[PDB]
Amino acid sequence: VLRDRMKEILSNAEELEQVVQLVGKSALSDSDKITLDVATLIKEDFLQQNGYSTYDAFCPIWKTFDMMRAFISYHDEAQKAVANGANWSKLADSTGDVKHAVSSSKFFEPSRGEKEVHGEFEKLLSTMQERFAESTD
Amino acid sequence: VLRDRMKEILSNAEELEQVVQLVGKSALSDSDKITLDVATLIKEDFLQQNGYSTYDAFCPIWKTFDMMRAFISYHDEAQKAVANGANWSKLADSTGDVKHAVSSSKFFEPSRGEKEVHGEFEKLLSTMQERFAESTD
Amino acid sequence: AEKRTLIAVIADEDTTTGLLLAGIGQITPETQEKNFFVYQEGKTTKEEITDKFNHFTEERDDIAILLINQHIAENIRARVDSFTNAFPAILEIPSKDHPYDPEKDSVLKRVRKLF
Amino acid sequence: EGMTRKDHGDVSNQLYAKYAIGKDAAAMKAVVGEEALSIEDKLSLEFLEKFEKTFITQGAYEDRTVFESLDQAWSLLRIYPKEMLNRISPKILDEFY
Amino acid sequence: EGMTRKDHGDVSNQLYAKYAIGKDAAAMKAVVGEEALSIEDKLSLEFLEKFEKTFITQGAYEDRTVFESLDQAWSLLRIYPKEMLNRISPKILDEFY
Amino acid sequence: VFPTRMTLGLMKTKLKGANQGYSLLKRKSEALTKRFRDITKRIDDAKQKMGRVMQTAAFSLAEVSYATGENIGYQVQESVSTARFKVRARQENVSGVYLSQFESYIDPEINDFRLTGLGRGGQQVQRAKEIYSRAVETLVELASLQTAFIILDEVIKVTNRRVNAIEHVIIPRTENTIAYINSELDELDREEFYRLKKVQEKKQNETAKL
């Protein structure tokens, strides 16, 4: 499920980027900014890895599932919030604290237990929904 | 000292020209207008060896130096002038005679006071000085 | 941006009194100067209209809209034509005892070039 | 014939032209916004996603002849008004919109 | 270690990233103008110049220690927040910012 | 001038970029010109509407002054030191570009003015303000459109320049570079085949003959 959606974000983000360069944009639809923004995160957490920092390239297959799970969830709340009304700047700023934590969650590897699905990510999910409510209203 | 400023002028001229083409002469700053004019003058008066009466006459390192003193002088005083508030139009029309003189200087045979410094080149230096002052206030 | 909230007037005496009843000009608290210029026919100078136009358009950047009577705008035409910005906006509205005449209107001259 | 319709040619034209405008509409949307987007572009925006998700997207054991293709065509097209569908004969259209 | 730091590979990476963008920001200026440019691209433009004429520009009898190189690199790199810098461990960037 | 090996990869994506960008700039121009025609018509109307609203009010103000028996406008200027009707700036997206708009708000700094007490004649002045407060408001909402219109004129010029720029400069620069490098690149490859072949004929012959 995530996989198709990971690919879908990175694909639309690519296209949008040529349109910013080519026309030399004076505006963006409020949804498209979200697509670009969610792609930036994908870049850091997965694509940026260093094979001699083992805190910055190691995850078991389940840990990987949880991190991607969090992203795909963020996109899902964000698309709904604009729809119910709320400005992009409102969406980005009110989500805020959880947006920092997910960015910075690429500095982790199993070291809080022999467990491949962590409290680290499970806690983020409920807090993310809580953040969504704020953005929307 | 003159060689370094001379190199810079040509190097900036090319880049500034690409903006005139695409964007138009509406994105320029006033100092950049100055770089465009002085450059056009250099193009003609050194590089051209084509006649208009007679193929051009022996110009030494000494002659060549005087030309460089007058072009470089024009550029400094003019940019000061625009920086310090002044019309572009006032400055270009005023240089006028001095520009005709450098163009045709090479056709005239070397030594006109001396080879070293010609009286024809010596006198322009004063004219620029007189103009710079009228312009400023 | 939101830093401009004042309406300046260049208008004939009776028109400026009206606008002021509605309340749109004032005597500023940061400079002690009106945001209105009271003009009379054949009894005030051609130079003074010029000074007022400049002052509100370029030496003031807290004026949102400068209203100007076409007839008065005509006197100082060079100066009206020559201000081409949209901050502040310059709006010619028909003067007193005159309907809409397109031949006194600075903005309509700009629009002609390109469409 | 008897395994196609004669309506085949008319629908190939309609399907094609609206999908192309939709490709243009995606790019347009991004520059202009949604607070300045044209009403025709909105129909083209929707058309782009439904043509891809119905006509192109389909299962690994789904099977199609020209009649089946043809029914699915008319449901995408239905959304456009009749006056935007003009590459089609008035005959066909009044029957399948 | 003891005349080349641990932060050496970290800082290189950062210096290249700001430079890639700076080079591109020049290119967008040529074509369209200041139309696709922004507060981020405008910084990057400044970066490309300051770096070119300060870091790369040196003498040909100048001996520069690997300790010197790193000290100068950090001084230059002050142009963006700590949160915009994530091409470096947040541990290392506080010590050497 | 340019690389003879793999200019095709960077140049190919430029070329596509250019024609794709051009098509798109044309749609943005078409939208800008689309709105422009409409506002030009609305603005000419709005000039007369404002003219009239001011004139009808202006005359009532003139009448009020002569009938009471004194000139009010002097006293009114002295009393005013705040502006009741002020405006809030907001950006509205019309087409690609954001235009500036004004929304008036009425702030209760002052209600009328402390000068009326002219006995019987004073009611004519109080009523005169009531009619003018309403007139001014029509002018202000209409005045907002004027601001956008000047803003559109400034943007269209940048936009007309770009549509020309892409077609005339970029597209033939991509064409000439791609084709010239393509032609040189294939040449190196072809001559090699001929050279390998030429020595192999020499070899074949030598083997064959006794």
TrEMBL record, chains A, B:
Oligomer status and interactors: V-ATPase is a heteromultimeric enzyme composed of a peripheral catalytic V1 complex (components A to H) attached to an integral membrane V0 proton pore complex (components: a, c, c', c'', d, e, f and VOA1).
Q: What is this protein called?
A: V-type proton ATPase catalytic subunit A
Q: Report the source organism.
A: Saccharomyces cerevisiae (strain RM11-1a)
The source's domain of life comes to Eukaryota
Recall the taxonomic lineage recorded for the source organism: Eukaryota, Fungi, Dikarya, Ascomycota, Saccharomycotina
Leader sequence residues: none
Locate the transmembrane regions by residue number: none
Indicate which residues the UniProt annotation says bind ADP 2: 49
**Family statement drawn from the similarity comment of this UniProt entry:** Belongs to the ATPase alpha/beta chains family.
Residue stretches making up the ATP synthase A/B type C-terminal domain:
1-90
Task: Give the subcellular location.
Answer: Vacuole membrane
